[PDB]
Symmetry: D2
Subunit: 115 residues, 4 copies
């Protein structure tokens, strides 16, 4: 699993379940092409987005639909979504875990990159 | 000053100085048109991006060039930039302060919305 | 003002107002003696805790009563308080701003140390 | 495993390995009694601190020795340690995951509480 996303809810102290996200990859013409999508599980994790072979060097964007998450909980949040944009595999294949910690008016995101 | 951006550096414990950013407003064709830009001051702040009359309801994106900041410090970063996408809404007088706390592999962003 | 504390609320997108805090200085017998205290203003800030002459090198602890804050808002919190423990060091003129961003089950704290 | 701690390094984008921490439990006389200790593994996690039977209701403090971690990497950080203080099991047994994201001048901590 070369790309995994974990989302946590800082209001409830729980995984953020059923959070939709879309991954894009920058094309040679500088447009964002769709790459993968899914939603987080009961553990707040989304696995299986891509494979080692398909996850080539490039600039990737993970768009996490945080607004829909908060609205379903009755909360009108500040952000439309959380965006994570990064260059991947520029020094060879790596495994990426992208984590997001969500509050209505704030989020934090980190990356753990392993060889 | 209806919109201010403040950027902090979590490695140095300092304002993040000379950080470039661009602000975009979402157009009707779902594209991002440039709206304002600047670089942070010695206090890590960027003021004067817009005026009350110009800052109408809509979806705005603040793109903070964090990669160039870490590059100038000789530190290898994860993100291409930090993106803050939000809806500005008219409900009484509202001033928006977007704050971002930067680390090489993580960032946090919050919004302080006041009257 | 060599020491200022700023507290923000990530659920409401606002300064965290009327948050009590106590500052302690570590004594030679490894106990915490009270040094200063106050409550945050309507801007979420607490100034005037100490003076340049009094704020000598040592280990300091800022205990922020986050539990009482969330209780007053009717929101069940995780932490009893938020603790910030640090060494103040003389290396040129130094002003310390401790910032804390509060959510019910999470907090973030940073230090901005300037001249 | 009713109590687990995970520590991440926001400068390197990696688990924070070999981070020492000590857990204390508040006694009836309001002193902090030692409860458990250990260090994080290669995955940045510390498991096996306690058991369901031993982890009774009470106020617990997790003291994470972040200063020693940064110093071994050549960095002089701001904080002496990261402290996480919380009431546990007040509504019956729960499982607690305490996470800390570390930077030299900042840290974030969250809790995931499961039934
Ligand atoms: O608005 C903020 C929030 C910001 C902040 C952002 C993310 C974080 O995780 C933390 Cl701890 C703190 O700190 C600040 C420092 C400051 O001098 C003035 C400010 O307005 C802020
Ligand atoms: O990987 C992480 C990191 C995440 C996190 C994200 C942003 C943050 O600011 C903080 Cl503190 C923590 O917390 C976690 C909680 C958990 O149960 C299992 C995990 O793997 C993580
Ligand atoms: Ca390459
Ligand atoms: Ca309206
Ligand atoms: Ca000295
Ligand atoms: Ca009870």
């Amino acid at each position: 699993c070369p790309l995994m996303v974990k989302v946590l809810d800082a209001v409830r102290g729980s995984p953020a379940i059923n959070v939709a996200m879309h991954v894009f990859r920058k094309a040679a013409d500088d447009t964002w092409e769709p790459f993968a999508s899914g939603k987080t599980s009961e553990s707040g994790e989304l696995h299986g987005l891509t494979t080692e072979e398909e996850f080539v060097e490039g600039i990737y964007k993970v768009e996490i639909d945080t607004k829909s998450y908060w609205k379903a909980l009755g909360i009108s949040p500040f952000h439309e979504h959380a965006e994570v944009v990064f260059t991947a595999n520029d020094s060879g294949p790596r495994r990426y875990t992208i984590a997001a910690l969500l509050s209505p008016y704030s989020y934090s995101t980190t990356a753990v990159v392993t060889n």
